[PDB]
């Protein structure tokens, strides 16, 4: 079967992270959309204009709004993209055939929206050469970050080639987790986000979303299906592109 | 010998085009800077804010200004980047050890700054699915363009891999040649631009800067040295990366 995949990058990244996966999925016959979220990739906003994870998600919500009735998509979120998935599913659950989490945060419906981010920061507290700043938007103080180049090399892009790491140095931008804003946000709903099919893809060689964290997430909020990719690194869509495409084909054949 | 190379992308592109070349040059021991010009790559401006090729060049001029006395660089410009080189050389000639033109426009000092662009448009008049728009800045009507995806596939990225073409679809932005503004600009000077060493690198398999055009440029304004790369396509820094690095090493050993 063929599907329409919507690929959702993580914070400080953009659609460019999907540059290897998108043509492979198209070569299987699928339709693929790779979005830039707000203030990401070549989106024209700067992060200091964005006040919440919900505002950050606007391009994904606008895309989903534009789907004609009856058209469903499979969302694929890497790393922090799982939060964009949860936000989107609470507005457009009927348009979502399934969500695929790719070394991603897996929010739940029992705890506040910041819960899994808070846990990540306990498991992985040292962000190396990452820098931080603050800005104010809509009366709140937001902590922004710019991912450190050593962190990128060692922890996110561990086994990627030098030309892929170079793209990350060139293209990663300032971003935010909006952690304190998430902590005050209404919970994700059981009727919307809770109702979608959820497929969790990971590798135990991820050097930032460490096995303790990912296995904790799986136990916290049971996925419909789990796929463990052997080897690779946090950027499986670069280091294990073919394996990711094969999994996504199976998802397209299972959920519609 | 080691040099400091400053890599200069073409219109509608950004530093990202150099993602393969930059690590190869660093692996030879060089220092490499790959700039985003105005309204290009992840630069925060939009093209409608930019009124001339000189304004477009600001990041290159600002970079050159910041070099301490006595430090020289080798400029490397692809495609339209040769115009940025000429602009820069008329302000900072003493900071430029040499300029390398990479399937690039080669402005002169005898004719108006638009001369080689006007010629290009005669040799290559059909830009396929490229779209155009106009905007006004500083009282002039500027023609902007967005490179067509078929043009990108067939003429610019002819022999590049699907993942490289995908990056171009994701990252190329609206831009301008500022052709009518160039046509009114004071000529490039013999004392500044005319005085720098100029190395012309090309392939006769370029499907946009066709052999008639490139050989015309070489005859029009004799380079100090010409290197012809066999095979490849217009994006030699993607299809012939190693050969480009080898040439640049020789340039670093010849000009300081």
UniProtKB/Swiss-Prot annotation, chains A, B:
Positions bearing the site annotation: Increases basicity of active site His: 206
Signal peptide start-end: none
Recorded consequence of changing residue 78 to A: Greatly reduced catalytic activity
Catalytic activity from the UniProt record: a monosubstituted aliphatic (S)-hydroxynitrile = an aldehyde + hydrogen cyanide; a disubstituted aliphatic (S)-hydroxynitrile = a ketone + hydrogen cyanide; an aromatic (S)-hydroxynitrile = an aromatic aldehyde + hydrogen cyanide; 2-hydroxy-2-methylpropanenitrile = acetone + hydrogen cyanide
Regulation: Inhibited by hexafluoracetone and rhodanide (thiocyanate). Also inhibited by trichloroacetaldehyde via a covalent link on Ser-79. Susceptible to several serine, histidine and cysteine inhibitors: is strongly inhibited by diisopropyl fluorophosphate, diethyl pyrocarbonate, HgCl(2) and parachloromercuribenzoate (PCMB), to a lesser extent by iodoacetamide (IAAM) and iodoacetic acid (IAA), but barely by AgNO(3) and PbNO(3).
Ligand binding ((S)-mandelonitrile): 10, 79
Task of the protein: Involved in cyanogenesis, the release of HCN from cyanogenic glycosides in injured tissues; the release of toxic HCN is believed to play a central role in the defense mechanism of plants against herbivores and microbial attack. Decomposes a variety of cyanohydrins (alpha-hydroxynitriles) into HCN and the corresponding aldehydes or ketones; two natural substrates are 2-hydroxy-2-methylpropanenitrile (acetone cyanohydrin) and 2-hydroxy-2-methylbutanenitrile (2-butanone cyanohydrin), but in vitro can also act on mandelonitrile.
Keywords assigned by UniProt, alphabetized: Lyase
InterPro entries, per database record: AB_hydrolase_1, AB_hydrolase_fold, MES/HNL
Residues of the active site: 79, 234
A GO molecular-function descriptor: aliphatic (S)-hydroxynitrile lyase activity
Origin species: Hevea brasiliensis
Impact after mutating residue 10 to A: Loss of catalytic activity
Identification of the protein by name: (S)-hydroxynitrile lyase
Family named by the database record: Belongs to the AB hydrolase superfamily. Hydroxynitrile lyase family.
Result of altering residue 206 to A: No expression due to instability
Binding site for 2-hydroxy-2-methylpropanenitrile: 10, 79, 235
Recorded effect of pH on activity: Optimum pH is between 5.3 and 5.7.
Practical use: This enzyme can be used as a biocatalyst for stereoselective synthesis of a wide array of (S)-cyanohydrins by addition of HCN to aldehydes or ketones. Optically active cyanohydrins are interesting intermediates for the synthesis of alpha-hydroxy acids, alpha-hydroxy ketones, or beta-ethanolamines, all of which are important building blocks in organic synthesis.
Entry's Gene Ontology BP terms: jasmonic acid metabolic process; salicylic acid metabolic process
Binding site for acetone: 10, 79
């Amino acid at each position: 079967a063929f599907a329409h995949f919507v690929l959702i990058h993580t914070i400080c990244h953009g659609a460019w992270i999907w540059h290897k996966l998108k043509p492979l999925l198209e070569a299987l016959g699928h339709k693929v959309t790779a979005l830039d979220l707000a203030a990401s990739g070549v989106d024209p906003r700067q992060i200091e204009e964005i006040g919440s994870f919900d505002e950050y998600s606007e391009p994904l919500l606008t895309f989903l709004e534009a789907l004609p009735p009856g058209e469903k998509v499979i969302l694929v979120g890497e790393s922090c993209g799982g939060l964009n998935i949860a936000i989107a599913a609470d507005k457009y659950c009927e348009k979502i055939a399934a969500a695929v989490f790719h070394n991603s945060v897996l929010p739940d419906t029992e705890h506040c929206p910041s819960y899994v981010v808070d846990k990540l920061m306990e498991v992985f507290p040292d962000w190396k050469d990452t820098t931080y700043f603050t800005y104010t938007k809509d009366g709140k103080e937001i902590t922004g970050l710019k991912l450190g180049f050593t962190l990128l090399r060692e922890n996110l892009y561990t086994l990627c080639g030098p030309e892929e790491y170079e793209l990350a140095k060139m293209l990663t931008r300032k971003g935010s987790l909006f952690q304190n804003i998430l902590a005050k946000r209404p919970f994700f709903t059981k009727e919307g986000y809770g109702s979608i099919k959820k497929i969790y893809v990971w590798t135990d060689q991820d050097e930032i979303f460490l096995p303790e964290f990912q296995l904790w997430q799986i136990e916290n909020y049971k996925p419909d299906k789990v796929y463990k990719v052997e080897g690779g690194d946090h950027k499986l869509q670069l280091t294990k592109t073919k394996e990711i495409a094969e999994i996504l084909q199976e998802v397209a054949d299972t959920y519609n």
